[PDB]
Amino acid sequence: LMQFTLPVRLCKEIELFHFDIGPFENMWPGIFVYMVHRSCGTSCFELEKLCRFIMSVKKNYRRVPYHNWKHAVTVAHCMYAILQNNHTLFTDLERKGLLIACLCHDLDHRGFSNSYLQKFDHPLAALYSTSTMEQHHFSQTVSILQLEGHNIFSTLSSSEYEQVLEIIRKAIIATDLALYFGNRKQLEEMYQTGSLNLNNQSHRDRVIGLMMTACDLCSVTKLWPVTKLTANDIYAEFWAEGDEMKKLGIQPIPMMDRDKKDEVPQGQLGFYNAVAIPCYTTLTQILPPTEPLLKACRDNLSQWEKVIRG
Ligand SMILES: [Mg+2]
Ligand SMILES: [Zn+2]
């Protein structure tokens, strides 16, 4: 009977795709519990276990400019908005699993890409050859779920537990952008030829993978003042990785070079055209109620076009 409530402005704007979770970090756990309760029910998780799972997840995110605790909650909010607008399409296990997968998808991120770990010869690159960081984020998630008093899935059967952990594993691995390109091409082909079948588990996995990419890139779907400020945090990480590449004796790509700061607007156009617009277009074809994400993405693309033209 202990329902979570938000102030009037948050209660209303939290339903919109472009919601910004605000600068008050101590409100983010309550915002996440509110989303879980409205998304799958007040009974799907024991509140005490859920709150201690959330605080351990928070503790395992680092103080990096972009891939931090705020990103985790923002990505879970985009998933909440997708699930709420496509209410009949997902199973009880999927709703439970996807919000948790989004909260944990970047656990213990250090601000470095998979390419940097490979060139540095980091131990994680020997342990996981492909999707290096993403396999580490899933491994961190399993570690937290195995802590005393943190198993939020304890009332699930052995079979259902294995299913929810498999949903989480695939959802987290799908956040590796290198896998997105082929996934979106396969989905576009299945949709156009009419062979896309949501009753086929293999097709469901692809659709969930595209939803993870869409949530993960949701900074490009906020209102322009938010999108523009978030780009500073994204580039603060890219530039630090570029500096680390220079220390290895490798010239970074222009996007990561802080001496090529002037090329940022043009690089943003390339990203929206090659990555963001295709992603939200294919997502709207499969899930028509996600159209506001594509609309906001197109608005930000034209704002970046205005930046290049002075
Ligand atoms: Mg990631
Ligand atoms: Zn992420």
UniProtKB/Swiss-Prot annotation:
Residue numbers binding a divalent metal cation 2: 106
Subunit structure: Homodimer.
Cleavable signal peptide: none
Function, as annotated: Plays a role in signal transduction by regulating the intracellular concentration of cyclic nucleotides. Can hydrolyze both cAMP and cGMP, but has higher affinity for cAMP and is more efficient with cAMP as substrate. May play a critical role in regulating cAMP and cGMP levels in the striatum, a region of the brain that contributes to the control of movement and cognition.
Binding site for a divalent metal cation 1: 71, 105-106, 216
Species classification: Eukaryota, Metazoa, Chordata, Craniata, Vertebrata
Binding positions (3',5'-cyclic AMP): 67, 268
Residues that bind 3',5'-cyclic GMP: 67, 268
Protein name: cAMP and cAMP-inhibited cGMP 3',5'-cyclic phosphodiesterase 10A
Organism: Homo sapiens
Residue stretches spanning the membrane: none
Swiss-Prot/TrEMBL domain comment: The tandem GAF domains bind cAMP, and regulate enzyme activity. The binding of cAMP stimulates enzyme activity.
Active site: 67 (proton donor)
Related illness: Dyskinesia, limb and orofacial, infantile-onset: An autosomal recessive, early-onset hyperkinetic movement disorder characterized by axial hypotonia, dyskinesia of the limbs and trunk, orofacial dyskinesia, drooling, and dysarthria. The severity of the hyperkinesis is variable.
Subcellular locations according to the entry: Cytoplasm, Cytosol
Family: Belongs to the cyclic nucleotide phosphodiesterase family.
Span of domain PDEase: 1-310
UniProt tissue specificity: Abundant in the putamen and caudate nucleus regions of brain and testis, moderately expressed in the thyroid gland, pituitary gland, thalamus and cerebellum.
